[PDB]
């Protein structure tokens, strides 16, 4: 329920947040809120101070409170922003002026966010045999648990996920058809938490390892850490960030 904040931009990138702060004058204490792109249920706070951008991850704690690492918990991202408008409490500066969404600009949603509500609805309907207002009351009654369940499993039916197939199989399926640069898929390996990203670069198939660390966080070695595979694909579809190129078209299943 951060959509109600006029300075919440949804799923924009660090770079887009920095472009918006520049457009807003880059004044000390100028700030906006965005959806975290690598922490599930998380937000990011982007603040101008000393003509630079400062970015803070606001995690959703186990108990449904919100905190920057090393900070007190708050009931909501709104409360955290209100609090940091009064007390710096370790932040680079006080939150002075929200940069609001310019007229007509909505919170950005990504591909997962567009499927989320329908996937939660269809799961509750099939699992619990509910319809109409009963169905909506169920969804609302367990929204946080349902959001978590659907986010951790949504990749299974996304077009770029090919399940447990071999290295050799993945090369064959990627090399069939038009050799579109950035054509990609993700496959499961042995360890139930390990994956590979398969990416077409100038007619060659690149294999990048995706490992689950002790937190449950997914990363390519030396790469940004994500709670989910769909976060990883959205990131590497926006910029290469260490890959030889950006992900483009999902490799169709057979």
């Amino acid at each position: 329920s951060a959509n109600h904040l006029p300075f919440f931009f949804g799923n924009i990138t660090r770079e887009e947040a920095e472009d918006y702060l520049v457009q807003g004058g880059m004044s000390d204490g100028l700030y906006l809120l965005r959806q975290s792109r690598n922490y599930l249920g998380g937000f990011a706070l982007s603040v101008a101070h000393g003509r630079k951008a400062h970015h803070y991850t606001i995690e959703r704690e186990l108990n449904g409170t919100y905190a920057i690492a090393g900070g007190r918990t708050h009931a909501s991202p709104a409360d955290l922003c209100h609090y940091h408008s009064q007390e710096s409490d370790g932040l680079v500066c006080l939150l002075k002026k929200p940069f609001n969404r310019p007229q007509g600009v909505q919170p950005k949603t990504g591909p997962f966010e567009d499927l989320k509500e329908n996937l939660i609805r269809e799961y509750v309907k099939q699992t619990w045999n509910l319809q109409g207002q009963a169905l909506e009351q169920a969804i609302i009654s367990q929204k946080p648990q349902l959001e978590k369940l659907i986010a951790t499993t949504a990749h299974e039916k996304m077009p770029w996920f090919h399940g447990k197939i071999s290295r050799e199989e993945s090369e064959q399926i990627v090399l069939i058809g038009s050799k579109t640069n950035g054509k990609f898929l993700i496959r499961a390996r042995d360890n139930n938490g390990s994956y590979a990203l398969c990416l077409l670069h100038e007619g060659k198939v690149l294999h990048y390892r995706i490992d689950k660390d002790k937190t449950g966080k997914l990363s390519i070695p030396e790469g940004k850490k994500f709670d989910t595979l769909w976060q990883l694909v959205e990131h590497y579809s926006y910029k290469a960030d260490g890959l030889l190129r950006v992900l483009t078209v999902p490799c169709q299943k057979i």
Partner: peptide, 18 residues
């Protein structure tokens, strides 16, 4: 080198409160 490695280094550093 059966798996490709990331090139460069990450310039995505978040600030925190301590």
């Amino acid at each position: 080198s059966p798996y490709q490695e990331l090139q460069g280094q990450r310039s995505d550093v978040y600030s925190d409160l301590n």
